[PDB]
Write a protein that holds these residues in place. Structure first.
Motif, PDB file in Angstrom:
ATOM      1  N   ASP A 142      26.929  40.450  17.924  1.00 22.59           N
ATOM      2  CA  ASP A 142      26.300  41.739  17.554  1.00 22.59           C
ATOM      3  C   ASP A 142      27.352  42.570  16.834  1.00 22.59           C
ATOM      4  N   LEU A 143      26.899  43.382  15.889  1.00 26.31           N
ATOM      5  CA  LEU A 143      27.766  44.319  15.142  1.00 26.31           C
ATOM      6  C   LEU A 143      28.456  45.241  16.154  1.00 26.31           C
TER       7      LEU A 143
ATOM      8  N   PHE B  80      26.161  37.014  21.872  1.00 24.90           N
ATOM      9  CA  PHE B  80      25.848  38.465  21.782  1.00 24.90           C
ATOM     10  C   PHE B  80      27.081  39.233  22.236  1.00 24.90           C
ATOM     11  N   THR B  81      27.188  40.491  21.815  1.00 21.77           N
ATOM     12  CA  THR B  81      28.253  41.430  22.217  1.00 21.77           C
ATOM     13  C   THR B  81      27.599  42.645  22.859  1.00 21.77           C
ATOM     14  N   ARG B  82      28.135  43.119  23.985  1.00 14.97           N
ATOM     15  CA  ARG B  82      27.588  44.296  24.710  1.00 14.97           C
ATOM     16  C   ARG B  82      28.042  45.608  24.055  1.00 14.97           C
ATOM     17  N   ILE B  83      27.171  46.613  24.102  1.00 17.31           N
ATOM     18  CA  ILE B  83      27.287  47.895  23.343  1.00 17.31           C
ATOM     19  C   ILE B  83      28.357  48.757  24.020  1.00 17.31           C
ATOM     20  N   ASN B  84      28.475  48.644  25.348  1.00 16.68           N
ATOM     21  CA  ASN B  84      29.338  49.497  26.210  1.00 16.68           C
ATOM     22  C   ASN B  84      30.810  49.365  25.796  1.00 16.68           C
TER      23      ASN B  84
ATOM     24  N   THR C 238      32.044  39.971  24.582  1.00 22.01           N
ATOM     25  CA  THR C 238      31.333  38.933  23.802  1.00 22.01           C
ATOM     26  C   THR C 238      31.040  37.720  24.696  1.00 22.01           C
ATOM     27  N   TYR C 239      29.791  37.261  24.662  1.00 21.52           N
ATOM     28  CA  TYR C 239      29.252  36.114  25.421  1.00 21.52           C
ATOM     29  C   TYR C 239      28.930  34.990  24.441  1.00 21.52           C
TER      30      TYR C 239
ATOM     31  N   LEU D 218      20.577  38.320  21.321  1.00 25.01           N
ATOM     32  CA  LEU D 218      21.075  39.604  20.769  1.00 25.01           C
ATOM     33  C   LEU D 218      21.075  40.659  21.871  1.00 25.01           C
ATOM     34  N   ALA D 219      22.001  41.611  21.793  1.00 25.64           N
ATOM     35  CA  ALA D 219      22.067  42.795  22.675  1.00 25.64           C
ATOM     36  C   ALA D 219      21.692  44.049  21.872  1.00 25.64           C
ATOM     37  N   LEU D 220      20.758  44.855  22.398  1.00 27.06           N
ATOM     38  CA  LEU D 220      20.167  46.033  21.698  1.00 27.06           C
ATOM     39  C   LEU D 220      21.091  47.252  21.714  1.00 27.06           C
ATOM     40  N   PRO D 221      21.192  47.973  20.574  1.00 22.52           N
ATOM     41  CA  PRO D 221      21.913  49.251  20.512  1.00 22.52           C
ATOM     42  C   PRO D 221      21.735  50.169  21.737  1.00 22.52           C
TER      43      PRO D 221
END
Ligand code: CA
Ligand code: CL
Ligand code: CL
Ligand code: NA
Length: 189
Positions: A14-15, A58-62, A67-68, A106-109
């Motif tokens: 994720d960005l 995916f990458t977590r927003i926090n 990154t997973y 994917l992880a959501l904003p």
């Protein structure tokens, strides 16, 4: 293999802070506007210390921004490119209900979605049909990632952009699905 080969992708993170990673075969491409050599092909084993190919990421927003990376029945969790202690883990143990051999994630904003065949799962820190809830997205995807206001679904050498608010593939010209190399990466002609 060059980033701009035009071949399909296996997974995308994720960005995060304007950067993400693309995976294809044994290669990790760091996509960052700042890079000296942007999308220099590095080996997954050299950057992440694991064998390719990888299934999904995916990458977590926090603020930790973990990154997973998923491969078969296992997943690895990283912070600043370093594997957390006591990884890998079994998907079944970390993500109750999520199957093995996922296609994309994917992880959501905090929401993460897993995609496998025609189905997807919602995970928060019961499958539904992709084409029912993600309007314009075909059954099966190779890879996915989240931006700020959109998500991207990758299928072979093409992709879709979905607006988060409407959960519809956007109307653009030429229309989705269209070339990843040409319209997503902006590779040279
Ligand atoms: Ca995949
Ligand atoms: Cl993915
Ligand atoms: Cl975006
Ligand atoms: Na992803």
């Amino acid at each position: 293999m060059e980033l701009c080969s035009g071949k399909p992708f296996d997974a995308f993170t994720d960005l995060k802070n304007g950067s993400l990673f693309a995976f294809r075969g044994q290669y990790s491409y760091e996509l960052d506007e700042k890079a000296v050599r942007p999308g220099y092909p590095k080996l997954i084993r050299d950057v992440w210390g694991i064998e390719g190919p990888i299934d999904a990421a995916f990458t977590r927003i926090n603020s930790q921004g973990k990154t997973y990376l998923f491969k078969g029945s296992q997943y690895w969790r990283f912070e600043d490119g370093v594997l957390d202690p006591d990884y890998p883990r079994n998907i079944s143990d970390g993500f109750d209900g999520i199957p093995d051999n996922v296609d994309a994630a994917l992880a959501l904003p905090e929401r993460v979605y897993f995609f496998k065949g025609k189905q997807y799962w919602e995970y928060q820190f019961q499958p539904q049909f992709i084409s029912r809830d993600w309007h314009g997205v075909p059954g099966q995807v190779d890879a996915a990632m989240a931006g700020r206001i959109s998500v991207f679904f990758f299928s072979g050498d093409k992709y879709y952009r979905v607006n988060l608010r409407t959960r519809r593939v956007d109307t653009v010209d030429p229309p989705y699905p269209r070339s990843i190399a040409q319209y997503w990466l902006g590779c040279p002609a």
